[PDB]
Amino acid sequence: EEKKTQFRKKKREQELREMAWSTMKQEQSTRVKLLEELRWRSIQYASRGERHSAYNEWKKALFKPADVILDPKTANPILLVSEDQRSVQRAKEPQDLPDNPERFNWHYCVLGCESFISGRHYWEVEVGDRKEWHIGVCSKNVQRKGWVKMTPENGFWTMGLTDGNKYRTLTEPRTNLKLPKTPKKVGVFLDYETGDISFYNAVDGSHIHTFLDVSFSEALYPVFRILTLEPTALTICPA
Amino acid sequence: KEKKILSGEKEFERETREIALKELEKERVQKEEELQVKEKLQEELRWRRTFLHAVDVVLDPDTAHPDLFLSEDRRSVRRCPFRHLGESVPDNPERFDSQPCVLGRESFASGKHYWEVEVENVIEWTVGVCRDSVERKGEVLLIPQNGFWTLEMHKGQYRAVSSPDRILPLKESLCRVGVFLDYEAGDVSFYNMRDRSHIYTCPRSAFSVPVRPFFRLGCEDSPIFICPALTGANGVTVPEEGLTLHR
Amino acid sequence: KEKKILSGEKEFERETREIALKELEKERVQKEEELQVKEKLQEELRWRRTFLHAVDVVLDPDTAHPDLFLSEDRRSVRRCPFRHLGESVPDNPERFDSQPCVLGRESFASGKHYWEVEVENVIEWTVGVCRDSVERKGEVLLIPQNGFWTLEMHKGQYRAVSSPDRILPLKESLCRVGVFLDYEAGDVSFYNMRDRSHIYTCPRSAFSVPVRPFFRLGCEDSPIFICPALTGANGVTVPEEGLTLHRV
Amino acid sequence: KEKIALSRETEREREMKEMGYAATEQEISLREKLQEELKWRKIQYMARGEKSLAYHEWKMALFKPADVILDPDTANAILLVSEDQRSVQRAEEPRDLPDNPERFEWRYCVLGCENFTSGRHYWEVEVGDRKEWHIGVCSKNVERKKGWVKMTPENGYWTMGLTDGNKYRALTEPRTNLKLPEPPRKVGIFLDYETGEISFYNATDGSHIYTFPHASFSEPLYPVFRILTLEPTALTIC
Ligand SMILES: C/C(=C/COP(=O)(O)OP(=O)(O)O)CO
Structure with a gap:
């Protein structure tokens, strides 16, 4: 009967080995993705990059x-x-x-359609x-x-x-x-896990403002x- | 016979299902009709919510300071020189003790209202709005952090929320003053009712409780008058020739 | 074999019964909440109209004479000769072509209303209330028989419903005039707005039809202004110091 | 011979699991080092906006x-x-x-x-x-x-x-x-x-x-x- 118990233990521990290898693979993929992402971050932050040689590139x-x-359905009348x-x-007059x-009903705001999670x-x-x-x-x-x-x-x-x-602000x-300078076009960037909201000038590349270190708990x-x-x-x- | 007797209650189970289903049916129809009537009421409110109201205020002799004299119509007050030679006024919790102030009797919680006051031949006065839950025993400071939104005349100058650093540059003496209130926007405004010119608007703040009118008199032996609302010709007889120059 | 299956299905049948009971109590509690909100709604409606209403008057340009000039905000009117000539004004069934008169945009059915007019230096004016089923195509006498309740000034004297035996013995010049309406009592009154004093009250009558404001401007190039309602600070930004001396 | 074979296979799978876990540990260590450097550079750049004490x-x-x-x-x-x-x-x-x-x-x-x-x-x-x-x-x-x-x-x-x-x-x-x-x-x-x-x-x-x-x-x-x-x-x- 001990043979059957040994077989059961072998099967269970093999499944644990499989789960360990899966965890390893996710870890390795995360590492390589973080390395490439850090390279892109470095070239973005590299300097006050404003001669369009980076803004398009790091934004894409x-x-x-x-x-x-x-x-x-959301607009004020x-x-x-x-x-x-x-x-x-x-x-000129409310509809x-x-x-x-x-x-x-009171403020003059219109919302978008889709949400960001x-x-x-x-x-x-x-x-x-x-x-x-x-x-x-x-x-x-x-509150609306x-x-x-x-x-x-x-x-807000x-x-x-x-x-x-x-x-x-x-x-x-x-x-x-x-x-x-006088902004003519404005780029809005959102990063959720970090908690970053950024406003940029999209004609040259200068930096306007950044809300940072905020914990979002909704959409x-x-x-x-x-x-x-x-x-x-x-x-x-459009894009 | 166990199978037969235990199967005998399937009809009862069917009956219970049946009564539950019909109960659901009349519930559905009843709630639908009630929803229709509620929708009609909501439409009427939405139409009627965008109006301006002109009110008439009658003063409350329960919150009046023991040294204030009110007219029999409760539409004028004066500060009297220690009239308490033989008069007792009990100290209920709603009566001011150290400040010469009077409150109105109506409490607002929605919509837009406005009223007018006559301050001619007066030296120091204060007019505004206050929360109903304000401390009334002991000396207090009339500051928006406590719930007071007022305008005052002090030593020949016109004062805002009673910070001495924002005197207003008015050009003539004020005779009639109008107070305007918008509850859903946190709007309290003061107007001059000679040209209908905007004078002041306080920073927006959430009320969250009913508000009441607030008057304060700082000089001696001088009246303040509240202009009554327009009443037309009710309570009086209109002859066929017509009513001309009624007093 | 049928007994065991019968027992197995009986427990499921008994278990599915309570679905009805949670459905039922949820329905009851929701009904209670709805009744509470409905009664609050009705109470606030009852607290609603018993008040006085200050109205915002805007004129409509489809009733005016082919001779009157209107402002772009629809709050001022003047009489100008030979300016609209050569411009095709449609002949509407509601157009005035006999007398130079304009009507308001809102109709009234119940309640109390009032408004104010600025007549500083106009020489001949008439202001009042008219039924929206009056004759617009003919030279109708401005008398309460056809449905006009008005006050006017004619050649330096202030007069009533325009019977020349009702000269009002005024003592000062009129700069701002107030008009008051009460549908239930059939009351139309005219007030002097410098000290809020009473001028005139028209004889009682039943309207039975929605009524509208009515303005008529005589031979004069001076315009008449209608005082806008108090708005406060809507559509504007308030700093932390406050808004002081706001001029549009 | 069967019981000992099953036991030695169990020990081999145990060794498999433990070295897999060791490689997991080294990988997460590398990842966490990268995360520290990334955050350090982030605050370095953000401070470079106007000035800082960082x-x-x-x-x-x-x-x-x-x-x-x-x-x-x-x-x-x-x-x-x-x-x-x-x-x-x-x-x-x-x-x-x-x-x-x-x-x-x-x-x-x-x-x-x-x-x-x-x-x-x-x-x-x-x-x-x-x-x-x-x-x-x-x-x-x-x-x-x-x-x-x-x-x-x-x-x-x-x-x-x-x-x-x-x-x-x-x-x-x-x-x-x-x-x-x-x-x-x-x-x-x-x-x-x-x-x-x-x-x-x-x-x-x-x-x-x-x-x-x-x-x-x-x-x-x-x-x-x-x-x-x-x-x-x-x-x-x-
Ligand atoms: C009418 C306007 C209201 C602005 O109120 P605020 O006084 O809060 O203006 P802000 O300081 O920019 O937030 C938006 O509808």
């Missing part, structure tokens, strides 16, 4: 392109969305639309020669009915321009940014905000 | 510290090296020294004993209120006799000098002058042989000063200190 290497589409679902405009429980993504937005805008990311369980301050402690990570000359209390959406009536619209560059 | 921590991690000892046999006649072989002060007149090919006949340069074949290294030198000096690295194959070798980064010399206390300029073509509002009193030199990078930093507040162009190395280098003006302020190495 370490971040995947995302297609962002605007849904009318003031806003207008195009047939391509790419641009946003402000109307008459039903009060579904996923619409911004894990990974590294990016997108590009055209601001043109506007005088007022705010862009960023937001959580899913944020009423007034709530746009703050990371409430679920945004920045933008007001008054035609004042650039700022929306924190408690608000801070002032000092740029030596994230892109968010846009406008407050003025202008002949210029907010365009989302 | 400067005097991250070098303890990325590059190994220096014990640089001067070589008197490479010391020029007009410079006297202290007995510690750590600091050198310019002397008035070239002392009695036999001709040495390692000694710069025209340049007033001193080379250290050790050789930087590979790896990453750094060192700080205090200047205080120094009026003129030149700092950097140079290779062995270069010319140490002819004085006509101009200052370019491609002759084996990676150097920069401060002159008058108001031009902190690199020894390249053209005369690249770099602006620096605050006159530092201690400067750090960072060498990366694998990628051929030279970094010139200020050891007061972690202010970036200069980055050389990406030219790959081909030979181990040696430290170079050049003094052309006699000034009481000296140079000390840390």
Whole structure:
């Protein structure tokens, strides 16, 4: 009878050996992936790389392109969305639309369609020669009915321009940014596991701002905000 | 007979299934009808929620400081020179003891409201809004961190939330002042009701509790008047010739 | 053999029964919550209209005369001669072509409303309330018989519903005028807005039809302004110091 | 024979499992080392945005510290090296020294004993209120006799000098002058042989000063200190 028990133990321990080898293989793959990723990170950080010889390269290497589409079901009744679902405009008078429980009734915000759970993504937005805008990311369980301050402690990570000359990031209390140039296109980058949100200038390559060391526990959406009536619209560059 | 008797209850089980199913059916239809009526009510509220209301305030003689004299209509007050020579006013928990202040009687929790006050021929006064849960015994500081949103006149200058570093550069003396409240936006605004010109707007803050009007009088022997709401011609007779110049 | 299978299925049948009971109690608790929210809704509706409503008046350009000039915000009107000539204005069934009058955009069915008008230096004006089923194509006398409840100024005197035996003995010039409406009591009143004093009240009548604001401008190039409702600070940004002396 | 065969197969599978686990441990150790380096570089770059106090921590991690000892046999006649072989002060007149090919006949340069074949290294030198000096690295194959070798980064010399206390300029073509509002009193030199990078930093507040162009190395280098003006302020190495 001891032979049968030895056979059973041999089978079980063989299965443990198989699981050990599988763990080994995942470890090796993770190591080689981390090595190549670190090389790409090094060439990205290498200097203040701004002569386009890196920005395109490291953006296509370490971040995947995302297609962002605007849904009318979230827009405040003031806003207008195009047939391509790419641009946003402000109307003179509010429209008459039903009060579904996923619409911004007070703020002037429109959300995207898809959510982000894990990974590294990016997108590009055209601001043109506007005088007022705010862009960023937001959580899913944020408050949509009423007034709530746009703050990371409430679920908003945004920045933008007001008054035609004042650039700022929306924190408690608000801070002032000092740029030596006029951004015309803005690139937004998101890294989930690390907790990194980055705003870049997409025409030359300079660096604007970075939210870092934040623990996300839910899903994230892109968010846009406008407050003025202008002949210029907010365009989302396709990819 | 065990098989037969144990199979005898399949009809009972079927009956129980049946009654459960019909109960589910009337539950479905009933809840659908109730949902329809609720939807109609919600539509009416959505239409009616975007209006501005003009209110009329009557003062509350329970929170009044022991040294304040109110008119019989409860629409004017004055600060009297130690009128308590033989008068006793008991100290209930809702009565101010060290501050000469009066509160309104209505509590708001939604929507937009506004009202008007006449401050002509007065020297020091304070007008604004306050939370109902504010400390009333002992000296307190009228600061938005405690729940007070006020505008004041002090030593010939116009003061904001009572920080002495943001005096306002007004051009003439104020005669009629308007207070405007928007609850869902954390909006408290002060207007001048001669040109209907915007004067001041306080930083937005979440209320989370009902709010009440707040008046404070700092001078001696001087009245403040609250303008009543427009009532038209109710309680009076309109002759066929018409009513002209009613007082 | 059938007894064992019968016992095996009987336990499953008895086990599947309680599905009904959790379904039932969940239905009951949800019903209780819905009834609570409905009663709160009804209570706040009852706390709703018994109030006074300050209205935001915007004029519609499909009722105006082919002679009046309107502002781009639809809150001002003036009378100008030989400016719209050569421009084809459609002949609508609701267009005025007899008298220079404009109507408001909102209709009223119940409750109390009031608004204000600015008549600083206009020489001939008429303001009031008209039924939305009045004659628009003919020279209708502005009298309460056809459905006009108005106040006007004519050649330097303030007069009532336009019977010339109702001259109002005013004592000062009128700069801002308030108009008040109460549907249930059939009440239309006119107020002087400098000190909030009463000017006139029209004889009681039943409307039975939705009513609208009504403005008529005489021979004068001076425009008339309608005071907008108080908005506060919506659509603007508030710093941590506050918003001071805001001019649009 | 069957029971012992099953037992020995069990022992063989046990050995399989244990060496698989050992290889797993070595692999996770390598991965964790890579993770540490990645995070160190991340904060290094993020601090380089404006400024930080992190400067005097991250070098303890990325590059190994220096014990640089001067070589008197490479010391020029007009410079006297202290007995510690750590600091050198310019002397008035070239002392009695036999001709040495390692000694710069025209340049007033001193080379250290050790050789930087590979790896990453750094060192700080205090200047205080120094009026003129030149700092950097140079290779062995270069010319140490002819004085006509101009200052370019491609002759084996990676150097920069401060002159008058108001031009902190690199020894390249053209005369690249770099602006620096605050006159530092201690400067750090960072060498990366694998990628051929030279970094010139200020050891007061972690202010970036200069980055050389990406030219790959081909030979181990040696430290170079050049003094052309006699000034009481000296140079000390840390
Ligand atoms: C109407 C506007 C509200 C802005 O309120 P805030 O005062 O919070 O402005 P900000 O400091 O930029 O967050 C957006 O709808």
